[PDB]
Design an enzyme around this catalytic site. Structure first.
Site, PDB file in Angstrom:
ATOM      1  N   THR A   6       1.072  -1.077   0.153  1.00 63.74           N
ATOM      2  CA  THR A   6      -0.073  -0.224   0.010  1.00 63.74           C
ATOM      3  C   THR A   6       0.880   1.347  -0.220  1.00 63.74           C
ATOM      4  O   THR A   6       0.194   2.402  -0.093  1.00 63.74           O
ATOM      5  CB  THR A   6      -0.944   0.156   1.243  1.00 63.74           C
ATOM      6  OG1 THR A   6      -0.080  -0.330   2.366  1.00 63.74           O
ATOM      7  CG2 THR A   6      -2.124  -0.850   1.018  1.00 63.74           C
TER       8      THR A   6
ATOM      9  N   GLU B 192      14.360 -24.326  22.951  1.00 62.97           N
ATOM     10  CA  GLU B 192      15.404 -25.304  22.463  1.00 62.97           C
ATOM     11  C   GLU B 192      15.504 -25.232  21.337  1.00 62.97           C
ATOM     12  O   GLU B 192      16.837 -25.572  20.727  1.00 62.97           O
ATOM     13  CB  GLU B 192      14.974 -26.867  23.015  1.00 62.97           C
ATOM     14  CG  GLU B 192      14.953 -27.099  24.468  1.00 62.97           C
ATOM     15  CD  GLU B 192      14.969 -28.639  24.519  1.00 62.97           C
ATOM     16  OE1 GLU B 192      14.617 -28.932  25.614  1.00 62.97           O
ATOM     17  OE2 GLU B 192      15.586 -29.246  23.774  1.00 62.97           O
TER      18      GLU B 192
HETATM   19  N1  GTP Z   1      -0.521 -10.530   5.788  1.00 62.86           N
HETATM   20  C1  GTP Z   1      -0.952  -9.448   6.307  1.00 62.86           C
HETATM   21  N2  GTP Z   1      -0.344  -8.216   5.794  1.00 62.86           N
HETATM   22  C2  GTP Z   1      -0.936  -7.074   6.164  1.00 62.86           C
HETATM   23  C3  GTP Z   1      -2.097  -6.829   6.545  1.00 62.86           C
HETATM   24  N3  GTP Z   1      -2.506  -5.519   6.855  1.00 62.86           N
HETATM   25  C4  GTP Z   1      -1.511  -4.799   6.137  1.00 62.86           C
HETATM   26  N4  GTP Z   1      -0.552  -5.761   5.726  1.00 62.86           N
HETATM   27  C5  GTP Z   1       0.774  -5.253   5.031  1.00 62.86           C
HETATM   28  O1  GTP Z   1       1.531  -4.596   5.860  1.00 62.86           O
HETATM   29  C6  GTP Z   1       2.009  -3.364   4.963  1.00 62.86           C
HETATM   30  C7  GTP Z   1       1.235  -2.140   5.313  1.00 62.86           C
HETATM   31  O2  GTP Z   1       1.353  -1.845   6.743  1.00 62.86           O
HETATM   32  P1  GTP Z   1       0.252  -1.604   7.816  1.00 62.86           P
HETATM   33  O3  GTP Z   1       0.339  -2.600   8.823  1.00 62.86           O
HETATM   34  O4  GTP Z   1      -1.277  -1.824   7.120  1.00 62.86           O
HETATM   35  O5  GTP Z   1       0.377  -0.084   8.466  1.00 62.86           O
HETATM   36  P2  GTP Z   1       0.291   0.441   9.651  1.00 62.86           P
HETATM   37  O6  GTP Z   1       1.396  -0.471  10.761  1.00 62.86           O
HETATM   38  O7  GTP Z   1      -0.971   0.203  10.424  1.00 62.86           O
HETATM   39  O8  GTP Z   1       1.096   1.934   9.787  1.00 62.86           O
HETATM   40  P3  GTP Z   1       0.495   3.162   9.318  1.00 62.86           P
HETATM   41  O9  GTP Z   1      -0.966   2.729   8.642  1.00 62.86           O
HETATM   42  O10 GTP Z   1       1.300   3.685   8.315  1.00 62.86           O
HETATM   43  O11 GTP Z   1       0.233   3.934  10.602  1.00 62.86           O
HETATM   44  C8  GTP Z   1       1.770  -3.961   3.595  1.00 62.86           C
HETATM   45  O12 GTP Z   1       2.901  -4.419   3.245  1.00 62.86           O
HETATM   46  C9  GTP Z   1       0.444  -4.735   3.806  1.00 62.86           C
HETATM   47  O13 GTP Z   1       0.439  -5.778   2.484  1.00 62.86           O
HETATM   48  C10 GTP Z   1      -3.049  -8.032   7.052  1.00 62.86           C
HETATM   49  O14 GTP Z   1      -3.926  -8.226   7.666  1.00 62.86           O
HETATM   50  N5  GTP Z   1      -2.110  -9.187   6.786  1.00 62.86           N
HETATM   51 MG    MG Z   2      16.396 -32.118  28.897  1.00 66.24          MG
END
Ligand code: GTP
Ligand code: MG
Ligand code: 4Q5
Ligand code: GDP
Ligand code: CA
Ligand code: MG
Lengths: 430, 440
Positions: free
Chosen positions: B179, B254
């Site tokens: 994103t 372990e």
């Molecule tokens: N596997 C998985 N990946 C996710 C998910 N939500 C977001 N991502 C991935 O995480 C990245 C985006 O970061 P996010 O976790 O959405 O962002 P945030 O940590 O909330 O940070 P800000 O929104 O910038 O404050 C991208 O690589 C997305 O594809 C999820 O529910 N599952």
């Molecule tokens: Mg042992």
């Protein structure tokens, strides 16, 4: 009334320690409640070597159970013979040692060791005439190896004129995939060379191979391994526990078996080899016992005795048999393979015979060898040690507990020196 | 005793946390109101599931978990959703304005306003423990909060808990579901900042998971829901040794001993099997031998890379379900014959194995078949560094023109932090090369 105080530390230590107490309790006619119910006076004559007497004529093992985590000791306390142990003699922590010698010897174990010594002291004070100590432990983990050797050193400081004896389980990649075991074992051997009088080298490599090759157990378990260990421990303590002439206490054994103070690592052997519940119907003949007890395949250390020479040997025969035939057969082994016995220690093989057979057998024999071939075991550990240590691999687990690399270098050098000293007497002529 | 506190940071961390905690409840028989009829000790206990669940006097089993996000809309779904009664409201922490895909806002501008409150809430959880073992931290590499706030949090945890262990589950970006264009910057910044603070980090490549969903589960266009259900099975596999006990169980610590030969070399590759649809699993028995063989097929890895082009330093097999020792030993024997698994010369080659007898669980409405047995392999392979090289290359392309760098500088960062972070990654890649070279 020459008392031995028994200590068992860590998982392996408590597992084989508990099995030892089950096996010899049955031999002495002591039931899980501590009540005597045997049929022979021979059973009680030296019962005080390993047992305290209570009121109600209860017999209590002079045993202290130690661990840095509660799991195995909870197992023991809930085992068959759990009730037999003195409840205050269970000394345990909660942190565990994470298979880490430094945690056992320097950090986690240090927090627990005074508690243990308090119990040791209470047991020793109760003794008419304490002989010394026996410890069961593995060398490959953290508690038995690190805290076990810490205990050995502290006990030696408080009891410097008593004999220290260990049953020490050597690691093998055939049985464990934990990568740091050669580090733990090398650090421990360094301690054992300096601070024990007698160490029985119980090799998991040998135990596994006996189970797999000889007993034809396709998937050996610790139960199977420990069956061999408890048979061996019963055999090698027979002369301590029953009326007898030879090696009847820890000091006399050491004087017969240890010609040079560092060379006190023994190769045990046993015949017949059995699996649990094999329950075999033919007794061995005296010649069979004698041939098998000296056979490489019957050794509890994975060393070929034909690659070395015997400095000293103790042999213990159990059961009703002809003492004449025993003498004849023992002489035959020596006279037929005289080149394997160092010629500069005359008459270096001693034989004991005890009328009481172990449970399930009519006839058995136990071998204790001080052989220069035991260097093969230390070489094996040393090679595994150096493969990692040359790259300082996994050392951060140890330096994180305050250790320096220098301590590893010193332990390695001391074990390599031990190896070289065996080779020296192997090649020595009269 | 041996408690584990989970911390779920940012959208990815929180949503994966949803999936994991739902799955844990099903595995342990905990209802969404937190009741567990099979648990006879009310209000406490030291059962294996208690490493992850505390208990109230009223019989509620409560995750030892904090959820934190810098905006509220993802955690708001938790607050109003199926498992809303499961969590105490104070475990769910939100700000108003997010990090806008900017490491600098997550670590500094916005993160600094909520970090004390977050640590306070973690401390309340820590106070409930009689032998805290460590933390499990779930977050994306790519998001501003997942990157920047996680780094800030990890630094603060080192100060407040010393060397108490901290493990990560880190979501590595993929273009199919990414994103933000600046995800490579955020990834490198957080990996540099967190490296000396983390004991063990399991990277989850979203492209690997995306591929597995498409290829093995025949999901046309995987959603985060599809990805997270698969991820949660892998996480569950890894934490199972902490949550269950059995005679053949081997603790995660372990495995960790074997997996981390030097402090910086702490990134295991996870491989999971079987991943199969109900349709294909019907009338199909997948043996111990079959699922074990699948661990060495790169198609089933959690990170795209090629271990056949690398060297192993460790291999661990984490089994669950109907799995007996004799069959594992026979399966490994076969593999060692047929596959060339090359180890470095300074490591032993034996695989470390744990078995948990409780079989895998699936959540209703999922695409995974329910199976009798499953395995997760954790390996330490030089090939994992491929994943760094791909990210480092993307970083280099942009940084050479300083593309987007002004967004970071405007929030108070300096170019020196970028170059310092990239140099640490260069050194990490070199470390992985060096451990692969034969000894003299
Ligand atoms: N596997 C998985 N990946 C996710 C998910 N939500 C977001 N991502 C991935 O995480 C990245 C985006 O970061 P996010 O976790 O959405 O962002 P945030 O940590 O909330 O940070 P800000 O929104 O910038 O404050 C991208 O690589 C997305 O594809 C999820 O529910 N599952
Ligand atoms: Mg042992
Ligand atoms: C050769 C290494 C040990 C010996 C075996 C043994 C462990 C065992 O015996 N274990 C795990 C505690 C439970 C115990 C046994 O159950 C299986 C119970 C019945 C027992 O023997 N219990 C005895 C009576 C008890 O006193 C006891 C002793 C020690 C510990 C716990 C309990 O299981 C086959 N192990 C790990 C194995 O065979 C494992 N295989 C490996 O580790 C292989 N490498 C992947 C090689 C080393 C063999 C498989 C399980 C994957
Ligand atoms: N023969 C035998 N070996 C064991 C047993 N339990 C553990 N071991 C071995 O002991 C070593 C691990 O040490 P352990 O005693 O488990 O660790 P500790 O609890 O830290 O002392 C490994 O080499 C294991 O193979 C056992 O019951 N019997
Ligand atoms: Ca309870
Ligand atoms: Mg967000």
């Amino acid at each position: 009334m020459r008392e031995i105080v028994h200590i068992q530390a860590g998982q392996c230590g408590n597992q084989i320690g508990a099995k030892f107490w089950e096996v010899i309790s049955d031999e002495h006619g002591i039931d899980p409640t501590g009540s005597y119910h045997g049929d022979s006076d021979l059973q009680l004559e030296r019962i005080n070597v390993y047992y305290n007497e209570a009121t109600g004529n209860k017999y209590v093992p002079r045993a202290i159970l130690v661990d840095l985590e509660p799991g195995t000791m909870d197992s023991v306390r809930s085992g068959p013979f759990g009730q037999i142990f003195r409840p205050d003699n269970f000394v345990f922590g909660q942190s565990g040692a994470g298979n880490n010698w430094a945690k056992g010897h320097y950090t986690e174990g240090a927090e627990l060791v005074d508690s243990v010594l308090d119990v040791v002291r209470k047991e020793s004070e109760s003794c008419d005439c304490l002989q010394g100590f026996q410890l069961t432990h593995s060398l490959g983990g953290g508690t038995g190896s690190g805290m076990g050797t810490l205990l050995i050193s502290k006990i030696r400081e408080e009891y410097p004129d008593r004999i220290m004896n260990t049953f020490s389980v050597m690691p093998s990649p055939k049985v464990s995939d934990t990568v740091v075991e050669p580090y733990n074992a090398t650090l421990s051997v360094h301690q054992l060379v300096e601070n024990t009088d007698e160490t029985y080298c119980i090799d998991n490599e040998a135990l596994y191979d006996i189970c797999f090759r000889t007993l034809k157990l396709t998937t050996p378990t610790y139960g199977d391994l420990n069956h061999l260990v408890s048979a061996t421990m019963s055999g090698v303590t027979t002369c301590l526990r029953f009326p007898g002439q030879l090696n009847a206490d820890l000091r006399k054994l050491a004087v017969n078996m240890v010609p040079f103070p560092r060379l006190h690592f023994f190769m045990p052997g046993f015949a017949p080899l059995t699996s649990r519940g094999s329950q075999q119907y033919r007794a061995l003949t005296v010649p069979e016992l004698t041939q098998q007890m000296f056979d490489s395949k019957n050794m509890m250390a994975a060393c070929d005795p034909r690659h070395g020479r015997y400095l000293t040997v103790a042999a213990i025969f159990r059961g009703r048999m002809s003492m004449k035939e025993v003498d004849e057969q023992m002489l035959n082994v020596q006279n037929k393979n005289s080149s394997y016995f160092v010629e500069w220690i005359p008459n270096n093989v001693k034989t004991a015979v005890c009328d009481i057979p172990p449970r399930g057998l009519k006839m058995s024999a136990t071998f204790i060898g001080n052989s220069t071939a035991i260097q093969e075991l230390f070489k094996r550990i040393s090679e595994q040690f150096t493969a990692m240590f040359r790259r300082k691999a996994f050392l951060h687990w140890y330096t994180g507990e305050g250790m320096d690399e220098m301590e590893f270098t010193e332990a390695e050098s001391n074990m390599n020196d031990l190896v070289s000293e065996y080779q020296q007497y192997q090649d020595a002529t009269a | 005793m041996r408690e584990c506190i989970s911390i779920h940071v940012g959208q990815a961390g929180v949503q994966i946390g949803n999936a994991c905690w739902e799955l844990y409840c099903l595995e342990h028989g905990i209802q969404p109101d937190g009741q567990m009829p099979s648990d006879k000790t009310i209000g406490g206990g030291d059962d294996s599931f208690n490493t992850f669940f505390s208990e109230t006097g009223a019989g509620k089993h409560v995750p030892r978990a904090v959820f934190v996000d810098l905006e509220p809309t993802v955690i708001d779904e938790v607050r109003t959703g199926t498992y809303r009664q499961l969590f105490h409201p104070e475990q769910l922490i939100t700000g108003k304005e997010d990090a806008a895909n900017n490491y600098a806002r997550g670590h500094y501008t916005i993160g600094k306003e909520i970090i004390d409150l977050v640590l306070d809430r973690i401390r309340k959880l820590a106070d409930q423990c009689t032998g805290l073992q460590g933390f499990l931290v779930f977050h994306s590499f790519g998001g501003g909060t997942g990157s920047g706030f996680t780094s800030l949090l990890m630094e603060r945890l080192s100060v407040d808990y010393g060397k108490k262990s901290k493990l990560e589950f880190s979501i590595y970006p993929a273009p199919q579901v990414s994103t933000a264009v600046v995800e490579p910057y955020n990834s490198i910044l957080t990996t540099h900042t967190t490296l000396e603070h983390s004991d063990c980090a399991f990277m989850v490549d979203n492209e690997a998971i995306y591929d597995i969903c498409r290829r093995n589960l025949d999901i046309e266009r995987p959603t985060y829901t599809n990805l997270n259900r698969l991820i949660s099975q892998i996480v569950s596999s890894i934490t199972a040794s902490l949550r269950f006990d059995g005679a053949l169980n081997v603790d995660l610590t372990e495995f960790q001993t074997n997996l981390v030969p030097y402090p910086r070399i702490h990134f295991p590759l996870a491989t999971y099997a079987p991943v199969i649809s109900a349709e294909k699993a019907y009338h199909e028995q997948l043996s111990v031998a079959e699922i074990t063989n699948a661990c060495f097929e790169p198609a089933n890895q959690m990170v795209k890379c090629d271990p056949r082009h690398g060297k192993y330093m460790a291999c661990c097999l984490l089994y669950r379900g109907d799995v007996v020792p004799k069959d594992v030993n026979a399966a490994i024997a076969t593999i060692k014959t047929k596959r060339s698994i090359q180890f470095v010369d300074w490591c032993p080659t034996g695989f470390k194995v744990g078995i948990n007898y409780q079989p895998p669980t699936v959540v209703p409405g999922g695409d995974l078949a329910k199976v009798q047995r499953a395995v997760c392999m954790l390996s330490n392979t030089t090939a994992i560094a491929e994943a760094w090289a791909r990210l480092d290359h993307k970083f280099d392309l942009m940084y050479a023109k300083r593309a987007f760098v002004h967004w970071y500088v405007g929030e108070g960062m300096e170019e020196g932090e970028f170059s310092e972070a990239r140099e640490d990654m260069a050194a990490l890649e070199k470390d992985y090369e060096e451990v692969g070279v034969d000894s003299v």
